[PDB]
Amino acid sequence: HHHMAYLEVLRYLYHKVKPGLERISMLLSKLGNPHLEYKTIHIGGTNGKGSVANMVSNILVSQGYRVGSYYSPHLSTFRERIRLNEEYISEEDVVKIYETMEPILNELDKEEIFSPSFFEVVTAMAFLYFAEKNVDIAVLEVGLGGRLDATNVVFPLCSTIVTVDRYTIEQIAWEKSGIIKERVPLVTGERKREALKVMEDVARKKSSRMYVIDKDFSVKVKSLKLHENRFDYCGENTFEDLVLTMNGPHQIENAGVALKTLEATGLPLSEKAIREGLKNAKNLGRFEILEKNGKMYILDGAHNPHGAESLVRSLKLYFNGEPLSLVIGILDDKNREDILRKYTGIFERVIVTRVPSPRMKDMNSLVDMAKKFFKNVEVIEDPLEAIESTERATVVTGSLFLVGYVREFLTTGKINEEWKL
Ligand SMILES: [Cl-]
Ligand SMILES: [Cl-]
DSSP states (O other): OOHHHHHHHHHHHHTOOOOOSHHHHHHHHHTTOGGGSSEEEEEEOSSSHHHHHHHHHHHHHHHTOOEEEEOOSOSSOGGGGEEETTEEOOHHHHHHHHHHHHHHHHHHTTSTTTOOOHHHHHHHHHHHHHHHTTOSEEEEEOSSSSTTOGGGGOOOSEEEEOOOOOOOHHHHHHHHGGGOOTTOOEEEOOOOHHHHHHHHHHHHHHTOOEEEBTTTBEEEEEEOOTTOEEEEEESSSEEEEEEESSOSTHHHHHHHHHHHHHHHHOOOOOHHHHHHHHHHOOOTTSSEEEEETTEEEEEOOOOSHHHHHHHHHHHHHHOTTOOEEEEEOOOTTSOHHHHHGGGTTTOSEEEEOOOSSTTOOOHHHHHHHHHHHOSOOEEOSSHHHHHHTOOSEEEEESOHHHHHHHHHHHHHSSOOGGGGO
């Protein structure tokens, strides 16, 4: 009933930049500083920030806190970005919060210097929503960087920089340590000296207690097994044979980071909640395995030569003896060839498909390239037909658009209208 209004909200958002906290601070001020209405946990880093945020939210939700959680970007629906107790905001509430902000945005939008960006608006929407919902705590994933990220208006219980990965490392590290706040502890999963040196200097300056993986806490992999990845944690507390459903050994480290983040915060937490929250954590399209109707799907949004190489590493751990099929769609704005090359020698069957997006061009040369690397190649242009066509455990990758689209269909049996926007 507010579905069309919801789509129209997304049109306004997606019609939308000088860096700074000035526009976001002013938007929030005009909304009553909703961000100051609850405790906050703030999570940045190049990789793992979404997983660590999710793990943190999930644990606190299990502990029975009323939790708002804020992510970016999204995979299948915009509503992944804003959650209450890890349930996506409804279309109706997105519309409601938007209608609340509308006159304020209309006013700010009159002048380019005051007009908030997409991310600024969405972030303020989350902050406002968390306030309207009377949350106890909000877990906030940094959009990008940290220092001048829209989320960085908070004063959290803990600031986490999961990693700093390649600007020099030192520059990137600096941008990220802008979420370090006075006296607020910092937790990091980072091990590069260059990166830690910066964070050390900022935290020491801010009188922030800093905790560093392998220094102030650690994890020990007991065993990796699909949906049942078992590890010990050593921080303030010690836990043995914790289980992650999420697959991949980096996720076990993200789990250590999440638990340290939670220790550093002081919040009361049960071991039950930690175990259940870790079991419940999910990072969508990030080496996500979904059994559907007996068949396995490895949903991974890898779209970089780097990301693809990681995928293959992860595949070798969990699917060693397994025959595999690949459904791949890559946009032409990506390094198609250097991506495809990662996947040689792995798949029993390769199906190139079209990324479902008006952005998809040059299917023709994509296919030709693939044919440069594998005897296999089939072209099944509709990616849902492509996945329907496999028997083997199937890796769907190449494009986040592709993965979010297929995931949606697999999990819902339909494709929401946001894909038409
Ligand atoms: Cl197959
Ligand atoms: Cl979408």
